[PDB]
Amino acid sequence: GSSGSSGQEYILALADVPSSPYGVKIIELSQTTAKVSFNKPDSHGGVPIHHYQVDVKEVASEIWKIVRSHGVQTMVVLNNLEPNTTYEIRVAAVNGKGQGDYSKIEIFQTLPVSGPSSG
């Protein structure tokens, strides 16, 4: 029939990448940080997702920053951002196969600095 390593290549070999996530929205937005909460993808690329790839950057800047999570969580907080500024973030599903597709580009604007003294 065949030689070399073979056996578990029935479907796991003809598998595809996971679909783009949904429900993505910023629940906790700050002047410097920004929390992005989303829901699992309506479907997976055959194999179980490993992690999510998030890419955020200023609508004016041309540098995309990649921030990986610490697991299969659908929630991640961003940092190192300027207040009163807007940034475009996109959530994608990355698995053994790879980075399927990016979800509807999201646009969030940090809060305008108010003061360190609770008011």
UniProtKB/Swiss-Prot annotation:
Glycans are attached at N84. Residues 20-113 form the Fibronectin type-III domain. Expressed most strongly in adult and fetal brain. It is found in: Cell membrane. May play important roles in selective fasciculation and zone-to-zone projection of the primary olfactory axons. This is Neural cell adhesion molecule 2. It comes from Homo sapiens (Human).
